[PDB]
Enzyme design. Structure first.
Site, PDB file in Angstrom:
ATOM      1  N   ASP A 192      60.403  47.465  -4.230  1.00 27.01           N
ATOM      2  CA  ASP A 192      59.108  46.960  -4.662  1.00 27.01           C
ATOM      3  C   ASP A 192      59.324  45.721  -5.511  1.00 27.01           C
ATOM      4  OD1 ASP A 192      58.255  49.352  -3.478  1.00 27.01           O
ATOM      5  OD2 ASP A 192      56.583  49.512  -4.859  1.00 27.01           O
ATOM      6  N   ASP A 223      48.075  56.915   3.017  1.00 22.01           N
ATOM      7  CA  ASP A 223      48.217  57.921   1.971  1.00 22.01           C
ATOM      8  C   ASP A 223      47.420  59.152   2.343  1.00 22.01           C
ATOM      9  OD1 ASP A 223      49.637  56.023   0.625  1.00 22.01           O
ATOM     10  OD2 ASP A 223      48.247  55.859  -1.069  1.00 22.01           O
TER      11      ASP A 223
END
Length: 228
Positions: free
Chosen positions: A7, A121
């Site tokens: 990330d 998700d």
């Protein structure tokens, strides 16, 4: 396969916790240990598409010999095109895949299903339904994982990244139901035993991020485990 992940915020590797500003040597060492695919999240771009870290992404992709899938606030056709032009192998589409399915179906038609990964998700609700949500801090969107997958099957959907944000049976179920799709799992990997738990599920790719940064195990060890 194992899919090591970083990330990135303004050139910095993060989890917020700082891991220094050396993403390229990190990625190169992941590849050196046998990784066939890498995953990058552009957190800066996800906050402001005008500040998408295209120049950095270009350098990182040029610096390894394996395909990199990249996501982070991809909202438009132009975002997708700019990432691919910079040399990205596949663009990871998150909220937009839930928000504007007819638009994203156009993207499949334009770019090809090999260029796109849908990142969904999922939280398991009270009834046991796999609810899709666009993020961990927002309520469910009112569509199940199966329903959203079936929306994109007619345009040749091939890659789905599935993050359980409620927490193995989940991955067994969806992989069995859609064997023509290569599912990736994300989240929950704290040690090598967690990778083993996914082995017989049908999951094709295992995203691994924080555990590599924390020195719990190496990419090499993850691959050996995955390959049994």
């Amino acid at each position: 396969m194992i899919i090591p992940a970083l990330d990135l915020i303004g050139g910095t590797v993060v989890r917020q916790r700082d891991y220094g500003n050396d993403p390229l040597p990190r990625l190169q060492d992941y590849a050196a240990q046998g990784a066939g695919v890498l995953h990058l999240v552009d957190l800066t771009g996800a906050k402001d598409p005008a500040k998408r870290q295209i120049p950095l992404i270009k350098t990182l992709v040029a610096g390894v010999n394996v395909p990199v899938q990249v996501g982070g606030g991809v909202r438009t056709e132009e975002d997708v095109a700019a990432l691919l032009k910079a040399g990205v192998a596949r663009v990871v589409i998150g909220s937009t895949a839930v928000k504007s399915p007819d638009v994203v179906k156009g993207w499949f038609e334009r770019f090809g299903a090999q260029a796109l990964v849908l990142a969904l998700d999922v939280r398991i609700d009270e009834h046991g339904t796999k609810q899709v949500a666009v993020s961990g801090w927002q309520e469910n969107s009112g569509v199940s994982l199966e329903q959203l997958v079936e929306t994109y099957l007619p345009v040749g959907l091939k890659h789905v990244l599935c993050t359980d944000i409620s927490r193995v049976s989940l991955y067994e179920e969806v992989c069995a139901r859609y064997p023509q799709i290569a599912f990736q799992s994300s989240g929950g990997i704290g040690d090598i035993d967690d990778i083993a738990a996914l082995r017989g599920t049908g999951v094709r790719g295992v995203i691994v991020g924080r555990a590599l940064l924390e020195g719990k195990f190496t990419v090499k060890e993850a691959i050996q485990c995955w390959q049994n």
